Amino acid sequence: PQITLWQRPVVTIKIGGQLMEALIDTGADDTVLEEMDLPGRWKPKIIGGIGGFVKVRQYDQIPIEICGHKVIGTVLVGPTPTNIIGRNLLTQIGCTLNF
């Protein structure tokens, strides 16, 4: 579909059989969701945002269903206030920027 930028581009994702709301973010190199337990093991990871660096878990190759398109990929889990779908899973769902 064609989503507009008048409001934040929020889509529902299905990770772990449960649905939540995520935010389409083309500026993020990776995907970072709010802290929780996912069905796998994790490693530690450090990623930086505006203002400072954060410490997150790194669940690798998790199967996440982004709005009809099923994908697999690395999701980071940390103290973020909003779930972010970065450009690792977006390129998978065939997402582009047009203007």
Place this chain on the structure above:
Amino acid sequence: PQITLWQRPVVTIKIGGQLMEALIDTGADDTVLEEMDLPGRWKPKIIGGIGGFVKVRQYDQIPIEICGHKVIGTVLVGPTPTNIIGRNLLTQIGCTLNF
């Protein structure tokens, strides 16, 4: 143009009669630039990011020529790794997400 997400979406903007590289970021509400002083007066603002809250200068109603379309809006300036083009000035050029 039709931009893909395999690479980071880097668009060149002209602000202050100077050219600079910027990132097309749909997750950012505001447009944040590198530390510098452009034409005009400023007021304060504290924005948030993944790694906490940072302090920036707010330059209101500034003319930026994104990708050739001359547009207007508030540009923030403070400490940031890259120049960010948020949703406020994206809508102005008619940017959309599609998949």
